[PDB]
Amino acid sequence: QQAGTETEEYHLPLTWERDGSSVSASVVIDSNWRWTHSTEDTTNCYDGNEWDSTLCPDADTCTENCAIDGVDQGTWGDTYGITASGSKLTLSFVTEGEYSTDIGSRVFLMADDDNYEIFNLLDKEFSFDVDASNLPCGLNGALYFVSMDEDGGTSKYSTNTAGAKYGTGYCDAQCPHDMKFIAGKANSDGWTPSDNDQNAGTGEMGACCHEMDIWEANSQAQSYTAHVCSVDGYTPCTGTDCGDNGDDRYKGVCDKDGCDYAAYRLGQHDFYGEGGTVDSGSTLTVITQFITGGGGLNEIRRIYQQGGQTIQNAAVNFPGDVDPYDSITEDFCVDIKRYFGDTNDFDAKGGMSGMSNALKKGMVLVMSLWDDHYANMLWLDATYPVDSTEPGALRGPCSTDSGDPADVEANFPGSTVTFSNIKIGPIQSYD
Ligand SMILES: OC[C@H]1O[C@@H](O[C@H]2[C@H](O)[C@@H](O)[C@H](O)O[C@@H]2CO)[C@H](O)[C@@H](O)[C@@H]1O
Ligand SMILES: [Ca+2]
Ligand SMILES: [Ca+2]
Ligand SMILES: [Ca+2]
Ligand SMILES: [Ca+2]
List C-alpha distances in Å: 142 to 17, 224, 228, 393.
19, 10, 18, 22
Spans of all domains in the chain: 2-431
Torsion of CA 266, 383, 128, 19, to 10 degrees: 60
- The best mutation among 222, 379, 388, 398 to test binding of ligand 1, ranked by most ligand atoms within 8 Å of the C-beta, falls on 379
What DSSP string describes 237-252? E-GGGG--TTTTTTSS
Q: How far is the CA of 391 from the centre of ligand 5 (A)?
A: 5
Look up 211 and say whether it is catalytic. yes
Q: What is the CATH code for 2-431? A: 2.70.100.10
Distance between CA atoms of residues 379 and 420, nearest Å: 26
- What's the DSSP call for residue 4? P
Resolution of the solved structure (Å):
1.6
Contacting residues for 44 by C-beta, under 8 A, at least 6 apart: 35, 36, 37, 38, 52
Ligand nearest to the CA of 185: 3
Pocket test for ligand 1, best of 208, 257, 339, 369 (most atoms within 8 A of CB): 257
**Of all atoms in ligand 1, which is nearest to the CA of residue 395?**
17
CB-defined site of ligand 1, < 6 Å: 174, 213, 216, 225, 257-258, 260, 379, 384
CA distance 29 to 21: 25
Does residue 216 have an active-site annotation?
Answer: yes
Protein residue whose Cα sits closest to atom 16 of ligand 1 = 257
Q: Assess contact for 346 and 255: CB atoms under 8 A.
A: yes
- Elucidation method: X-ray
Distance between CA 126 and CA 69 in Å, rounded? 33
Angle between helices 330-340 and 351-360 (to 10 degrees): 130
* Active-site pick, 125, 216, 274, 390: 216
CA distance 184 to 201: 18
Give the ligand 1 atom nearest the CA of 144.
21
**Which atom of ligand 1 is closest in space to residue 342's alpha carbon?**
13
Partners of 207 in the β-ladder:
236
Q: How far is the centre of ligand 4, averaged over its atoms, from the C-alpha of 206 (Å)?
A: 15
416, 91 contact by CB (below 8 A): yes
Residue 395 assigned to a binding site = yes
DSSP string of 84-143? EETTEEEEESEEE-SS-EEE-EEEEEESSSS-B--B--TT-EEEEEEE-TT--TTEEEEE
